[PDB]
Each structure stands twice: as structure tokens, then as C-alpha cells.
Amino acid sequence: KDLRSPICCILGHVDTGKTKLLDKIRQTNVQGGEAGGITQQIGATYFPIDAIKAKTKVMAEYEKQTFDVPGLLVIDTPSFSNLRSRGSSLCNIAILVIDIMHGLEQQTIESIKLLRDRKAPFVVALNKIDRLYDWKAIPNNSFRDSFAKQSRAVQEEFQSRYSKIQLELAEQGLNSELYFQNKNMSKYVSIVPTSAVTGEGVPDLLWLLLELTQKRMSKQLMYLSHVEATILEVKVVEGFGTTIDVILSNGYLREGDRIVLCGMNGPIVNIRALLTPQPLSEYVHHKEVKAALGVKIAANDLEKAVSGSRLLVVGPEDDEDELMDDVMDDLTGLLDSVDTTGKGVVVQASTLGSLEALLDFLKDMKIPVMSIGLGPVYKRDVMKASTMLEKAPEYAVMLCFDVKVDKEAEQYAEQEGIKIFNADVIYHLFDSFTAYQEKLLEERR
Fold first, then answer.
1. In the chain, what are the domain boundaries?
2. DSSP-assigned states of every residue in 63-111
3. Does 129 carry a binding-site annotation?
4. Where is this region: G3?
């Protein structure tokens, strides 16, 4: 069957060894040789199927192998992969990282709810097994071979910490099991013990990713001419100006293509350049690109482009206005969910998905929202909170999620009485906000 590469993503609490794990997955160096052809793309790293074979050679004695996909695509940055609205998904399968030395943490809890609300398929990487006392490492080994060669005390400690984490997941409404002991691969979460330091378990992880996607999600991997593209990030590049970084999940892109996307001031409508990184910052130019890959698009008027936006191509038969109204549905739908004349807090987020997640939580959690925005916070944005200084300074604050605040903007906010909360984590914004609300409640007199 004509399949394209599965797309996977990685997430989990901070300091769980996510980036380190990613680096281990990407290194050329494996047990007995090297994995060749591993290429850097825009926002993602690409693994041709031969590189996966090399990486999973040690897994062949423990499982049957399947190599029907052309390769594997991994998003390079650990929410950023959940940037579109809840309605769709570019990431085929997620990797939830759990620190075995700390178990379930609060940002793991958030991740799980996020994955659940999207019905995103995922596995967990039970990371940092090398931190178990007296663990003897065999670099880039399969988990089961290494585990069998451990002392008993080490195996006992693993079982103890693993069974506890297993109970924590069940408290979150998740049945989980070691991947090779899982009797229900679609309902029960598969656990893969890994080490970002040694590479142990990484072959298992890659084998599992290929297994779940090819055996249980082959329909999603079927290549189609229909264009599926989601804006990953908006970046200014010197000899191009403002560019957009997209993940092309299916279809073709051709330079010269007329494209429609969601913008902050309304819809945006031609591709000048299709760019990929040069490995020997400089880019390669392509007349056309085929899914699946991460690619950078150069075009005019991309300055106001929205992260999370779908990307549509205007064909011979399409009406541009209909296509423009289509992509704007996701952003516009968020606008009409807040009370603007009624008055509450200001909110700004990085993407459509993170904005939606924050808004739904805030409504769920009684906190009135007055205004919303996307991307980097400027003074213009914080001034929207000025209307809240006198009538109820309690709501004269900004809730910022995963966005940068300009020095210029944080200076101004403090000239006034505008408190700025900025976090990577929703419960952090909430905790900060309530504490501020409570600090005003013994401004008793």
C-alpha cells in the first residue's frame, strides 16, 4: 500500500529527559554500526526506513518486524505539536515521557487530559532507567536484554517504581502495561522503559511506534493527493522576510501555488519558495515537495500568520472566499466564546490549540475572559487590560501561555497596575492568578 511516513511527537513534564531522549533517537551511532540518512527538516527530523532498521536491529530477536513505510518523522520541539484546534491532528502518535524516578507529575496530568480530549493515540516512554541504583548499562540495547542481565535488587526496584506509576495512571483513568505484556493495544497505554543517557529501550520505542502505526493506523498513513498542511511556526528569515514553517501530512505543494491561511487580522491569500535545510542558516529550493515532511514556505503577506492554522490550496474550481471562510472558522469561533462588553481577564497564547485549551479551562474554572490574542505580547496587547484598572483591577491582568513578552511590554505593564502571568503550564497561570486574587482580599482596608 502507498504509505507516507508516520508523524510522531514527544511531550511530558519538564526535566524528564525529553530533549535528551530526542537526541539519542537522532544520533547516527547504534549498537554494531551507524544509522545513515537521518536528515534535518524544518521543525522535524526525518528517519529513512533503513535508518530505522539499523536502530531496531537489536529488536528483531524479540519481535516480528515491519518496514512498509518510507520512513519516520519526529517533531523536534517537545504542546507545539498540538497547535491546531481539537477537531484535527497532524501528529499520528505521541510519546508521553514519564520520569521513572519521580513518577506522574502535574504537567503529566495536563498532558494526559490534552491527549484525551483529542483522542490522540500515544505510548509512554518510562525514561531514566539508568538512574536506578546499580543499573549496568549496555549502550543502545533492547530493554528486555538489558533488564534480564540486571541484578535482582535492580529488577525489584524497577518493578516497585513501575507498579506505582501504573497505579498513578489508573487514577488518571488510564490502564497501562509494559508494551510486550499489553493485551489491548488500542485501549491500554503501552509503556516502554527507556534511557536518554545509554540508549537502552530506544530500539523498543522505535519498534513500537512502527508497530502501532502500521498495524493499527495504516489508513491514516495512506498517501493522498488531498493537501493536508498545518502551520507549525512563523519565522522571519533574512533573505525572505516572514516565512511559515508547515508540516505537510498529505498531498503535494508546488511553488506558485495559491494558498489560503488564517491570519490575525483576517484571512490571508502565492508560494515563492519551498525550502528545506542544507546539511553541508542556508536552504535548498524545491520546485515541489511531497508529504510527509516539514517544510518552510516563503511568500508575501505572511506577517500576521496564525500558528495552528490549516493551509489550503486554491485549485481551478475553488472559490477563494469559501476557502478563506473555512480556515477562519477555527480562529473566529474562539472570538465569539468570550464576553467583550461584559468585562474580565485578558488572554494571549501561542497557537489556536493552546488558546482553545486555556479558554475552555478558564470558563470551566469561573474566570471571565474579556479579550484574546495570539503570539508575542506587545504593549498594544497589554493596553487592552488598561480598561480594567479602575472598575475592577482584580481582572487587570494578562494570562500568557507559551509566548514571549517584550521587555518594552513588561516595562509598561508595571508603570500601570497590569500584572502579567506567563507560563508553560495552565495550572501555573491558575495558581498565580488565584494567589493574586487572594492578595487583593487582605487589601482588606
1. 1-224, 225-336, 337-445
2. S-----SSEEEEES---TTS-S-TT--S-SEEEEEEETTT-S-HHHHHH
3. yes
4. 76-78
Half-sphere exposure of 263 (CA within 13 A, CB side): 13
Q: Is 250 annotated as a binding residue?
A: no
Nearest-angstrom CA–CA distance, 202 and 192: 8
Q: Is the Cβ–Cβ distance between 154 and 133 less than 8 Å?
A: yes
Q: Is 431 within any annotated ligand binding site?
A: no
Is 296 marked as binding a ligand? no
Domain 1-224 has CATH 3.40.50.300: yes
Query: Does the annotation flag 29 for ligand binding?
Result: no
Residue 17, marked binder = yes
Q: Which fold has domain 337-445?
A: Rossmann fold (3.40.50)
Q: Which three cell numbers stand for residue 315?
A: 485549485
**Is 297 assigned a ligand-binding role in the annotation?**
no
**Is 65 annotated as ligand-binding?**
no
* Ligand-binding site membership of 321 (annotated): no
For this PDB entry, the determination method is X-ray
Q: Resolution in angstroms, to 1 decimal, for this deposition?
A: 2.5
The fold for domain 225-336 equals Elongation Factor Tu (Ef-tu); domain 3 (2.40.30)
